[PDB]
Amino acid sequence: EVETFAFQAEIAQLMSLIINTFYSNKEIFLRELISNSSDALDKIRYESLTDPSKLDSGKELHINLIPNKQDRTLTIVDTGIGMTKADLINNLGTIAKSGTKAFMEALQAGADISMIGQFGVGFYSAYLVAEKVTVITKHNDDEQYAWESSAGGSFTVRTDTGEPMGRGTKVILHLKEDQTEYLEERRIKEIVKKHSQFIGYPITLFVEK
């Protein structure tokens, strides 16, 4: 049972700008996704301060980076608050309509694409490097769902049949054929050290083979 949705016109416009604009500094996608994961981990931490049972779905608060050269995927996993089905459909918990508006007024006033995260739509920087993005998520108040989009104006949502997650979000980047440098251990390490060195949660870079 797969539901197919149209992006709001402004989000489709943001996504086409990210895909079609010539912009070499693509590596900031990882900073933006790690920052999103950190924000989601902050939220479940804050909720657990007054209700410890919110961590019954998992006490550990962390971020994992999993490259897979055979599948040509880079997966960013966190054990944050996760997203309900409603949040997934509503632009993955973002204020994407007003954020895109603010972002594009900034771009014509001297900003560049690397500043996307200041406008709440940093998730969509995934399409700097990915031809398709899958988002698997589990929130304490909902079931496990899979969101997917290859851009082109539509996304799908289905109940996830895969591995149970407990709580949190998994962003699977199906990389473009010429963006496989982001599967290389030394390149990911360099980017994490450059842009994410002060994130307040353990970031574990998995190795392969």
Ligand X SMILES: OCc1ccccc1Oc1ccccc1
Binding residues for ATP: 36, 78, 97, 123
Interface region with ligand X, contact rule CB under 6 A, candidates 12-20, 58-66, 75-83, 154-162? 75-83
Q: What are phi and psi of 156, to 5 degrees?
A: -120, 155
- Indicate the SS3 state at residue 208: coil
Q: What angle do CA 164, 40, 96 make, to 5 degrees?
A: 105
Q: Cα 207 from chain centroid?
A: 21
- According to the binding rule CB under 6 A, does residue 34 interact with ligand X? no
Q: Is 37 in the site for ligand X (CB under 6 A)?
A: yes
Asked whether position 79 contacts ligand X by CB under 6 A, the answer is: no
Q: How many CB atoms lie within 10 A of CB 184?
A: 12
Decide: is 78 part of the binding site for ligand X (CB under 6 A): yes
d(CA 12, CA 16): 6
Site string for ligand X, 82-101 (x = CB under 6 A): -x--------xx--------
Cβ nearer to ligand X, comparing 69 with 205: 205
Q: Does 148 bind ligand X (CB under 6 A)?
A: no
